[PDB]
Amino acid sequence: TGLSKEELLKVAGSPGWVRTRWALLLLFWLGWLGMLAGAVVIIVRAPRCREL
Amino acid sequence: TLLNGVAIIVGTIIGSGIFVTPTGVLKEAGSPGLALVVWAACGVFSIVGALCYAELGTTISKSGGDYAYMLEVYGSLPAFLKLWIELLIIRPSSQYIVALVFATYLLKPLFPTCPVPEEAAKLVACLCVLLLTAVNCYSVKAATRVQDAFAAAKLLALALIILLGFVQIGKGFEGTKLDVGNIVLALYSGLFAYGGWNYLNFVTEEMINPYRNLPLAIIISLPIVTLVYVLTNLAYFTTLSTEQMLSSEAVAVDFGNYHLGVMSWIIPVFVGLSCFGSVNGSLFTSSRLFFVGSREGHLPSILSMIHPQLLTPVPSLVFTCVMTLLYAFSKDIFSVINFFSFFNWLCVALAIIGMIWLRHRKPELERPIKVNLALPVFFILACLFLIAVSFWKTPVECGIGFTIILSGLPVYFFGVWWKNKPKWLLQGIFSTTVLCQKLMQVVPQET
Ligand SMILES: CC(C)CCC[C@@H](C)[C@H]1CC[C@H]2[C@@H]3CC=C4C[C@@H](O)CC[C@]4(C)[C@H]3CC[C@]12C
Ligand SMILES: CC(C)CCC[C@@H](C)[C@H]1CC[C@H]2[C@@H]3CC=C4C[C@@H](O)CC[C@]4(C)[C@H]3CC[C@]12C
Ligand SMILES: CC(C)CCC[C@@H](C)[C@H]1CC[C@H]2[C@@H]3CC=C4C[C@@H](O)CC[C@]4(C)[C@H]3CC[C@]12C
Structure with a gap:
């Protein structure tokens, strides 16, 4: 069911989907490093506990 | 051999919940003496649960977890509602936790x-x-x-807490709440740590050959788990005050900060790695349910597919993942443990009710294991007890969860039972599917 392997191996035309899938894979790691930077900002600017 | 079987099941059951839930049982049981009794009670409930799943895991034997049993006992809508609960409530919430x-x-x-x-x-x-x-x-x-x-870090951290607890005793109680309401939330918090046996217990039958030896692996192993859980709680209670253990979201780091001096590089690292292992395990073992649920025709055809250069089930991982990430909208970790627990035990209720209804409806169906009816007739009532209290002890979590369940009836009719005939709708579904196929580069598995 759906489009099979034997079709999809030629539907991946490089100017469209291959460049698109490169862009989304970069956007994920850019966005996850964004979320890592966001978490590191919160941990740096949150107020540290007073020592006992 | 049976001794090596126990070393597979104990390492499967022990989990990461033991690092969350001590604070949970202590908050509801009020004081240590009753918290240890709840840890034992959770052990005994797991022994009765596991042996009922030794039966279902050898009588029906169909691959893919509880859904595979629901296809035989109920079919149709209740089978889809198990899959829908398990993918939108159970497997997301236990990953987020x-x-x-x-x-x-x-x-x-x-x-x-x-x-x-x-x-x-x-x-x-x-x-x-x-x-x-x-x-x-x-x-x-x-x-x-x-x-x-x-899997090594899981046991290394948990054993280290016990050996530190023993040297604390070598150098070296009332139960202040007793409301049935709270003690069901203590039981939910303690039962969470045992919560492996309904998913995977049947794996041991592929290396322990005699069917009467699978009950021996259970009956030996779950007392060993209960012993470890009681001993880790004694390690905390012999080192920390109730007024400390209720204040800290990460109780083993308090204990590690007391004893070790090198604290930062030990309990936070080894427990952290155990949870990084447990999140990984819940992702890796997820695909089985999507393959089965789409093969048996309840679940959308795209979620079956695989990325053919890597043989990894990309659309099923991405759906698993995004459901887990929405639980970031929840308020508090013990809110989500209550929520998970309600639907987890309500699913196990439907399974064990089902087993007795099946023993009635189709007698002597060649069962390799046949437990005494005296076990399920206590256990079903124990599942009902937890649920029945929880309807009124924790209403709002059940309300949003039953809102998820009732939102499954539309997609059951539209997706499976009504089989809506319009050709424009089918071409829209197809177009949506091939878009995803092209945008993830994914193909069907070998039928
Ligand atoms: C699963 C992965 C992504 C976990 C990443 C956790 C991140 C947010 C944590 C782990 C270790 C952390 C750092 C450890 C120590 C310090 C020194 C302190 O003076 C400022 C914050 C800083 C610099 C932390 C920033 C946040 C940090 C990088
Ligand atoms: C919406 C679907 C597609 C999921 C993909 C989007 C991801 C990146 C979204 C989904 C839910 C989001 C989280 C939801 C809530 C919170 C709590 C808030 O105090 C800080 C941000 C944080 C932690 C968000 C971070 C980003 C997040 C994880
Ligand atoms: C087919 C797919 C896309 C369906 C998506 C359903 C999503 C939106 C649902 C299913 C389960 C839901 C969660 C169930 C429980 C709670 C606890 C509550 O106190 C806050 C909201 C929160 C955290 C919900 C957020 C939304 C949620 C993640």
């Missing part, structure tokens, strides 16, 4: 006294679930090695 315990323990050494900032705990929980989603998408050959390793 373990991803968040990871996050609090990884952060807690930067916040030794004051509570770790929730807005940061939730981002670092998310960073863990996305990173392990990416690793499971890129390579089963890598994500297997990530599972093989950190």
Whole structure:
């Protein structure tokens, strides 16, 4: 069911989907490093506990 | 041999919940003496649960977990509602809980006294679930090695807490609440740590050959788990005050900060790695339910598919992942444990009710294991007891959960039972499907 392997191996035309899938894979790691930077900002600017 | 069977099941059951839930049972049981009794009671409930699943895991034997049994006992709508509950409630919420315990323990050494900032705990929980989603998408050959390793850290951290507890005694109680309401939330918090046996217990039958030896592996192993859980709680109670253990979101780091001096590099690391292993394991083992649920025709055809250069089940991981990441909208970790527990035990109720209804409806169906009816007729009532109290002790969590269940009836009719005939609708469904296929580069599995 759906489009099979034997079709999809030629539907991946490089100017469209291959460049698109490169862009989304970069956007994920850019966005996850964004979320890592966001978490590191919160941990740096949150107020540290007073020592006992 | 049976002795090596127990070493597979005990390492499967022990989990990461033991690093969350001590604070949970203590908050509801009020004082240590009753918290240890609840840990034992959770053990005994798991022994009765596991042997009923030794029966279902050998009578019906169909692959894919509880859904595979629901197809025989109920079919049709109740089988889809099990799959829908398990993919939108159970498997998301237990991943988020373990991803968040990871996050609090990884952060807690930067916040030794004051509570770790929730807005940061939730981002670092998310960073863990996305990173392990990416690793499971890129390579089963890598994500297997990530599972093989950190199962050692799980037991290393948990044994270290006990041996530190023993030297604390070598150098060296009332039960202040007793409301049935709270004691069901104590039982939910304690039962969470045992919560492996309904998913995987049948795996041991592929190496322990006689069917009467599978009950022996259960009956030997779950007392060993109960012993470890009681001993770790004694390690806390012989080191920490009730007024400390209720204040800390990561209780083993308090205990580690007391004894070790090198504290930062030990309990936070070894417990953290155990939870990084447990999030990884829940992703890696998820695909089975999507393959089965789409093969048996309940679940959309795209979620079956695989990325053919890497043989990894990309659309099923991405759906698993995004459901886990929405639980970041929840308020508190023990809110989500209550929520998970209600629907988990309500699913186990439907399964064990089903087993007795099946023993009535189709007698002597060649059962390799046949437990005494005296066990299920207590156990079904114990599932009902937990649920029946929880309807009124925790109404709002059940309300949003039953709102999820009732939202399954539309997609059952539209997706499976009504089989809506319009050709424009079918071409729209097809267009949506091939868009995803082209945008993820994914293909069907070999039928
Ligand atoms: C919406 C679907 C597609 C999921 C993909 C989007 C991801 C990146 C979203 C989903 C839910 C989001 C989280 C939801 C809530 C919170 C709590 C808040 O105090 C800080 C941000 C944080 C922790 C968000 C971070 C980003 C997040 C994880
Ligand atoms: C699963 C992955 C993504 C977890 C990542 C957790 C991140 C947010 C944590 C782990 C270790 C942390 C760092 C450890 C120590 C310090 C020194 C302190 O003076 C400032 C914060 C800083 C610099 C932390 C920033 C946040 C940090 C990088
Ligand atoms: C087919 C797919 C796309 C369906 C998506 C359903 C999503 C939006 C649902 C299913 C389960 C839901 C969660 C169930 C429980 C709670 C606890 C509550 O106190 C806050 C909201 C929160 C955290 C919900 C957020 C939304 C949620 C993640």
